[PDB]
Amino acid sequence: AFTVTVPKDLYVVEYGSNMTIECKFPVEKQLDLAALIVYWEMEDKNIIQFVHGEEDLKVQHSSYRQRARLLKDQLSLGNAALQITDVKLQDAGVYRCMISYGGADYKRITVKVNAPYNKINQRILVVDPVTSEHELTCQAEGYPKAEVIWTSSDHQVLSGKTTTTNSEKLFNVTSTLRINTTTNEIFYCTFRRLDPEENHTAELVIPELPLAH
Amino acid sequence: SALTQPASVSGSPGQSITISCTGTSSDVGGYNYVSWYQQHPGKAPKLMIYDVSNRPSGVSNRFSGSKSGNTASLTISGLQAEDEADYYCSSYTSSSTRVFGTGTKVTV
Amino acid sequence: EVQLLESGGGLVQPGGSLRLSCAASGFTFSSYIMMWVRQAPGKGLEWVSSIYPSGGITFYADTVKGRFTISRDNSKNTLYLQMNSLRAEDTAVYYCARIKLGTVTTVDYWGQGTLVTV
Numbered sequence: 001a002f003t004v005t006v007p008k009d010l011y012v013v014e015y016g017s018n019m020t021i022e023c024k025f026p027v028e029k030q031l032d033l034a035a036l037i038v039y040w041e042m043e044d045k046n047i048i049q050f051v052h053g054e055e056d057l058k059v060q061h062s063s064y065r066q067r068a069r070l071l072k073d074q075l076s077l078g079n080a081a082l083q084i085t086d087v088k089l090q091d092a093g094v095y096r097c098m099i100s101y102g103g104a105d106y107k108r109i110t111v112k113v114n115a116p117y118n119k120i121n122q123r124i125l126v127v128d129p130v131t132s133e134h135e136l137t138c139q140a141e142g143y144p145k146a147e148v149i150w151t152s153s154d155h156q157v158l159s160g161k162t163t164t165t166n167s168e169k170l171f172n173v174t175s176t177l178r179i180n181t182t183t184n185e186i187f188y189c190t191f192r193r194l195d196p197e198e199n200h201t202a203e204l205v206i207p208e209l210p211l212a213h
Numbered sequence: 214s215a216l217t218q219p220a221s222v223s224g225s226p227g228q229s230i231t232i233s234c235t236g237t238s239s240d241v242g243g244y245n246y247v248s249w250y251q252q253h254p255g256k257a258p259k260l261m262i263y264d265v266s267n268r269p270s271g272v273s274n275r276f277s278g279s280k281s282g283n284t285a286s287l288t289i290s291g292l293q294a295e296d297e298a299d300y301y302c303s304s305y306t307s308s309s310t311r312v313f314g315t316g317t318k319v320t321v
Numbered sequence: 322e323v324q325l326l327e328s329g330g331g332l333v334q335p336g337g338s339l340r341l342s343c344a345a346s347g348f349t350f351s352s353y354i355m356m357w358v359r360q361a362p363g364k365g366l367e368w369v370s371s372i373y374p375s376g377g378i379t380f381y382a383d384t385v386k387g388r389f390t391i392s393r394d395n396s397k398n399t400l401y402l403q404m405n406s407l408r409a410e411d412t413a414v415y416y417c418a419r420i421k422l423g424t425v426t427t428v429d430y431w432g433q434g435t436l437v438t439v
Binding site for chain 2: 358365366367368382416421424425426427428429430431432433
């Protein structure tokens with residue numbers, strides 16, 4: 001009947017942030033750390049192997065070194081928590097924790113990762129000064145795949161051309177718009193993706209003297 | 214539960230050859246952990262590559278590995294006649310288990 | 322610089338008992354996940370049992386669940402498999418496989434086996 005309990009079986013965590021994952025195990029009176037054993041794993045990858053108050057660091061995975069730690073402090077309350085920071089995307093997947101202290105049980109938990117596209121990069125250039133043909137360009141990086149919607153100041157949608165591609169596994173999304181326009185005409189690109197439905201809208205203001213390429 | 218490796222392949226010296234390993238959305242096609250093992254009959258199986266392509270120090274560069282979608286492939290180059298042996302692939306699985314392949318017997 | 326020596330297998334009746342051992346020489350065995358893997362003659366190779374380094378966490382394949390039990394003495398740096406009421410389908414070669422550090426399931430070094438015949 002000795003059982004391990006996880007307060008949350010889900011984690012939706014944004015790229016590069018930090019998260020603590022929690023496991024709970026019965027403790028009465030004071031915790032004997034000689035007799036405590038913890039293991040943290042993610043798919044085929046060990047993460048921590050904590051035997052006898054001493055965390056075995058020869059065996060932790062390469063991809064985790066100096067990133068994810070077992071908080072040694074909470075344990076005394078029966079809470080053995082994995083602390084990872086700078087959530088790296090390839091951490092998305094199913095973890096599971098295993099506690100042998102007098103008895104043993106394990107519970108698995110999963111975590112997925114977002115990466116909003118909220119830093120948008122603009123470029124505005126003329127390609128044909130006579131026809132006033134300009135080229136509006138938004139790019140941005142995130143996870144999972146995104147799509148790009150172009151809109152005129154008067155809120156009409158317009159046809160763009162976009163390219164999705166990879167950075168590590170990150171998505172790089174470029175979209176350009178070729179439309180005749182003049183100075184001080186404002187246009188918008190909004191980046192909309194799925195998963196945790198999210199959107200980020202940039203404003204592009206045509207300059208009097210745009211560059212050309 | 215098994216990984217399907219075509220049992221009969223073969224080829225002559227200084228040649229390239231590719232064994233195939235196919236499996237489910239839940240094991241070889243879902244994870245980047247697929248390992249390949251080389252053993253001559255009645256002997257001591259030798260890890261050759263791991264984590265889809267990675268090979269440990271001490272395996273000739275004549276061995277690389279590849280995973281395309283659901284299907285994974287072990288390639289031998291500069292092929293020689295010691296390398297004729299039963300070879301197995303393997304993968305981690307959603308059950309936190311390693312499935313192994315039926316094995317292929319390459320013959321020089 | 323590493324050796325894994327299976328011993329104890331032989332001819333036993335169906336329903337009998339056999340204790341398979343694995344002598345382990347090599348890296349610090351108190352830190353490794355260890356495993357048993359069986360090869361039926363000519364057939365594919367299957368995983369039977371896992372054991373974590375310490376804490377006594379073990380795992381068994383569904384065919385084998387309940388009549389096989391695995392253990393390990395981290396001082397004597399060896400590994401055991403107790404086999405009870407051997408069925409007829411349980412007759413195959415038995416390998417003792419060390420799990421590469423970091424990786425939960427990926428063996429790297431193996432021993433040469435020992436025969437079990439039902």
